[PDB]
Design a binder for this molecule. Structure first.
Ligand SMILES: *[C@@H]1O[C@H](CO[C@@H]2O[C@@H](C)[C@@H](O)[C@@H](O)[C@@H]2O)[C@@H](O[C@@H]2O[C@H](CO)[C@@H](O[C@@H]3O[C@H](CO[C@H]4O[C@H](CO)[C@@H](O)[C@H](O)[C@@H]4O[C@@H]4O[C@H](CO)[C@@H](O)[C@H](O)[C@H]4NC(C)=O)[C@@H](O)[C@H](O[C@H]4O[C@H](CO)[C@@H](O)[C@H](O)[C@@H]4O[C@@H]4O[C@H](CO)[C@@H](O)[C@H](O)[C@H]4NC(C)=O)[C@@H]3O)[C@H](O)[C@H]2NC(C)=O)[C@H](O)[C@H]1NC(C)=O
Ligand SMILES: *[C@@H]1O[C@H](CO[C@@H]2O[C@@H](C)[C@@H](O)[C@@H](O)[C@@H]2O)[C@@H](O[C@@H]2O[C@H](CO)[C@@H](O[C@@H]3O[C@H](CO[C@H]4O[C@H](CO)[C@@H](O)[C@H](O)[C@@H]4O[C@@H]4O[C@H](CO)[C@@H](O)[C@H](O)[C@H]4NC(C)=O)[C@@H](O)[C@H](O[C@H]4O[C@H](CO)[C@@H](O)[C@H](O)[C@@H]4O[C@@H]4O[C@H](CO)[C@@H](O)[C@H](O)[C@H]4NC(C)=O)[C@@H]3O)[C@H](O)[C@H]2NC(C)=O)[C@H](O)[C@H]1NC(C)=O
Lengths: 209, 210
């Protein structure tokens, strides 16, 4: 009978590196032509702040609109658990919509990062799988990349975080490389970014031993 | 805001073992007191079927009804990609609600199952991680289990399927064992059930290599 509001956290990576800009994003769907104007109010722990930015809106292929406010956040505020309140008012709304988001609560825990070589069985293929196991980490916000010789390896896929039996999270990252690259003896690095790591970052190497 | 309909597919194990009973489940929620009568029609590839089993409505604590209908599917109908339509009629609807579900479309691909021992750096811990890599399967419906010496191992978690570059899926299963059980030389088995495996099953073993 009116729109819907959705609130999104910053990218894990954006909050760990001071050079990057972490953003909280407030998204309004089902905005129809007849009642086209949406507003936004923002709050960080009950205050209001004014540095949010409304980027102008897009017509959907179902003839409705998508409208987005974007608040930049302080890295340390996000990591310290401050609460970020989106407030949406619209003529079709009977009561304004508040929505809230925050970082997962609890003592952060350091990921353990382990590289595993391809299995003997796989070595009959033209391409092989380099595995990075990242386990024991909390909260689930994490970024994982691969490189070789300081250069980014982009042919990888990473699983979402999975809740482990001790309340921490784990994931696996799979890098796929030409078998010959693995045989010739190239070093591949899995890098992991996480708040509980020293300087928010660690790398583990993997090469043919 | 009238009733809504959720249509649930069978369990991956159920469609792969003839001994099991695969079901499609159509569930209707937010049925009102003022219009409580619900009708289901079921279709398999658009042809009506009449062997569903519908339970009588159950009132929820929020003063709405929930109504469930169960269709028993034949194993080979599901694997052959038949489509299952639940049609739901209620006098609070302006038109009946239809939902359709089937096995994801595309040519099935056989999973490659590879087992991977603990990192050397992990054998510092009291517990260690045995890994099962399952890749290159399609569709993503799969079941993964661990055992040793006949019996199920409880302490394992499996990732959801992840869409790979080539349009197939992969996942990993992690089994956590006490380091001594790995040092003692016990054999552990990752078994995988998928429609593109022979007898829909394969099992690969892992053990401390001498
Ligand atoms: C008219 O058109 C639009 C567009 O159609 C869409 O695009 C077209 C081209 C076609 O492809 C369509 O098939 C396609 O659907 C329709 O818009 C869709 O409408 C629904 C609402 O009805 C929205 O659903 C919400 O989605 C969010 C997740 O949103 C992210 O992921 C989407 C991809 O999966 C992506 O499209 C979104 O843009 C968004 O992406 C994120 O964006 C941020 C900011 O940009 C970015 O920083 C992120 O990186 C990015 N992430 C990505 C890309 O992965 C989902 O969270 C919502 O689910 C909650 O609410 C449900 C209730 O509807 C509920 O069932 C769920 O359980 C879930 O509930 C919450 O879960 C959490 C955690 O458990 C928690 O808060 C609570 O437990 C619970 N909260 C509750 C219950 O309130 C929700 O599903 C789509 O975003 C939207 N699509 C687009 C493109 O905007 C529209 O419906 C059409 N209108 C019609 C047909 O009438
Ligand atoms: C009034 O009460 C009733 C019952 O509530 C009950 O009583 C109240 C008082 C409280 O005590 C409640 O806590 C209690 O539960 C409420 O009914 C609920 O209504 C919601 C909708 O508002 C339904 O939500 C859907 O949930 C399903 C998941 O449902 C399974 O899992 C649930 C737990 O996770 C479990 O509770 C359910 O029973 C059900 O369990 C499965 O059951 C099948 C069949 O029996 C069984 O074989 C399975 O083994 C079993 N699984 C289990 C137990 O784990 C979820 O799938 C739905 O998500 C879709 O819809 C969203 C839009 O609504 C969308 O945003 C989501 O992304 C998702 O959308 C789909 O996305 C997929 C890909 O993700 C895609 O393929 C589809 O195209 C897409 N579909 C779309 C867009 O439409 C959804 O979240 C609850 O299940 C239902 N509860 C029950 C018990 O039936 C009612 O809302 C209350 N009314 C009020 C308060 O006004």
């Amino acid at each position: 009978g009116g729109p819907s509001v959705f609130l999104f956290p910053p990218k894990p990576k954006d909050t760990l590196m001071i050079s990057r800009t972490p953003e909280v994003t407030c998204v309004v769907v089902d905005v129809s032509h007849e009642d086209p104007e949406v507003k936004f109010n923002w709050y960080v722990d009950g205050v209001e702040v004014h540095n949010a930015k409304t980027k102008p809106r897009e017509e959907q292929y179902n003839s409705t609109y998508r409208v987005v406010s974007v608040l930049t956040v302080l890295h340390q505020d996000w990591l310290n658990g401050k609460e970020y309140k989106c407030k949406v008012s619209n003529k079709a709304l009977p009561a304004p919509i508040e929505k809230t988001i925050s970082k997962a609560k609890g003592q952060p825990r350091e990921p353990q990062v382990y590289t595993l070589p391809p299995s003997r069985d796989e070595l009959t293929k033209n391409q092989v799988s380099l595995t990075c196991l990242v386990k024991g980490f909390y909260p689930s916000d994490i970024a994982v990349e691969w490189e070789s010789n300081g250069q980014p390896e982009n042919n990888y896929k990473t699983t979402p975080p999975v809740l482990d039996s001790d309340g921490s999270f784990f994931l696996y990252s799979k890098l796929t490389v030409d078998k010959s690259r693995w045989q010739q003896g190239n070093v591949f690095s899995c890098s992991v970014m996480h708040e509980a790591l020293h300087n928010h970052y660690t790398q583990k190497s993997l090469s043919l031993s």
